């Protein structure tokens, strides 16, 4: 009944208050979607050995993407919470260090929308028509409302939305189709479809497992009933489902925790086949160190390693969401581990978000300002 380790939550803001509290009781926590860099320091949350890379690598990939796309005037939109703030801060820092990709405006989405707030974001973005591409670091909840508000603005194709980690290969945020979200860029850590998880899901019904209390309302949401629905319906070929991108990371984290427990049983406990009495009071520091010292092959074959900060090595893929007139689906376009490998030939079914059009081919000079992104035209006599 005692918990040796707890899987960390997705939200970085949630994960902060989870991890600081659990550090007092000395229990390691492994997350699957909390990639905020402020949790990567081994001085504030020591028991946060996460299996996903930090947001600094995401910011580096994003700045490399805009550099390769010749983008220098990109707007920034972030929601409340630690994840969005840390992501946009890392993006700004990495763009200022190199590339010269400044930020036009920084927009904030409150945790408590008041209807009128979301359409304030769109007309605040529209006040600077030069800034076309907009960086989004919010989750699906605010992303859907932002897309809906932008659709009512009759500005289809004006904004080049960029997807964050929370806006990966998912269907709910892109449920607005391409009417307002045509050809949106997206970054996601290196995922892989789990055949075992798919097989497990293929044999799940309403009455198959009673442990999942939420499965009843999950089925109710999937098929609206209590419009009565039958118990013989199959979700495999009727819901058009798609497994989330981070579930592979959940399985990887569970495997790493199991490997750490196996190592503890092999080393601290004797050669018996049961829990030795010494392992009954599991020590938090020892288990955290064992988690940090794991080495095994994952389901997809990617190695699993833990550094001193408990962060996975950088590995990301860049996709684009658009309609091909046959089937709207995500396709692997670019790879990012330490340097950009984006494929230009598979972008936008090439537009540039330049702050100012070229002044003149020698007829007039170009000047700069505090932000070196806009070439201010000046007519020499």
């Amino acid at each position: 009944e005692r918990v040796v380790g707890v899987i960390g939550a997705s939200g970085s803001s949630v994960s902060i208050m989870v991890a600081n509290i659990l550090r007092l009781f000395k229990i390691p926590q492994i997350s699957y979607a909390s990639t905020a860099p402020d949790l990567s320091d081994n001085s504030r949350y020591d028991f946060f050995s996460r299996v996903v890379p930090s947001d600094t690598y995401q910011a580096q990939a994003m700045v490399d993407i805009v550099r390769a796309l010749k983008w220098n005037y990109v707007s920034t939109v972030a929601s409340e919470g630690s994840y969005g703030e840390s992501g946009v801060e890392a993006f700004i820092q990495k763009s200022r260090e190199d590339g010269g990709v400044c930020i036009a405006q920084s927009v904030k989405i409150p945790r408590e929308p008041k209807a009128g707030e979301f359409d304030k974001i769109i007309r605040r973005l529209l006040e600077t028509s030069n800034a076309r591409a907009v960086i989004i670091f919010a989750n699906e909840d605010d992303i859907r409302r932002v897309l809906e508000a932008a659709r009512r603005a009759n500005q289809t194709g004006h904004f080049f939305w960029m997807g964050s980690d929370s806006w990966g290969s998912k269907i709910a945020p892109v449920l607005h189709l391409e009417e307002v979200a045509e050809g949106a860029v997206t970054i996601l850590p290196k995922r892989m479809s789990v055949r075992g998880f798919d097989r497990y899901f293929s044999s799940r019904t309403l009455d198959n497992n009673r442990r999942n209390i939420w499965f009843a309302e999950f089925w109710e949401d999937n098929f609206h009933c209590k419009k009565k629905c039958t118990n013989r319906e199959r979700i495999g070929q009727d819901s058009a489902y798609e497994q989330e991108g981070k579930v592979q990371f959940v399985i990887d984290a569970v495997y790493a925790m199991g490997h750490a427990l196996h190592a503890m049983h092999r080393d601290l406990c004797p050669g018996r086949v049961g829990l030795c009495p010494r392992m009954d009071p599991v020590d938090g520091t020892q288990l955290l160190k064992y988690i940090r010292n794991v080495n095994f092959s994952g389901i997809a074959g990617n190695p699993v390693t833990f550094n001193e900060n408990g962060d996975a090595p950088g590995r990301y893929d860049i996709y684009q969401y658009q309609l091909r007139n046959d089937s709207a689906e995500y396709k692997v376009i670019g790879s990012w581990t330490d340097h950009l490998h984006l494929r230009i030939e598979r972008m936008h079914w090439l537009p540039r978000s330049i702050c100012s059009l070229p002044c003149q081919p020698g007829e007039r000079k170009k000047t700069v300002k505090g932000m070196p992104c806009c070439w201010h035209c000046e007519p020499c006599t």
Binding site: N20, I21, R23, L24, S43, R44
Partner: protein, 87 residues
Amino acid sequence: NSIRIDGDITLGGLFPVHGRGSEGKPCGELKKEKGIHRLEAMLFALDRINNDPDLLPNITLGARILDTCSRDTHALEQSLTFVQALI
């Protein structure tokens, strides 16, 4: 240690007695101007409340002050001690 005196009502207290320490130690230089002044203010207020017959007659108020060190982790540990003592 900390400031713990006996009383009918035990009031908790977090005060930045020490400044924000570097990576070497969680607690840095003690903030004599900041922490000690607030500590003495709370102590004087508690003494005045205890000595006031109009406010809570025949009732004394205890002290439950622990150091904060201007650090989130230290303050959260002190609050953990608080909630453990409460339960």
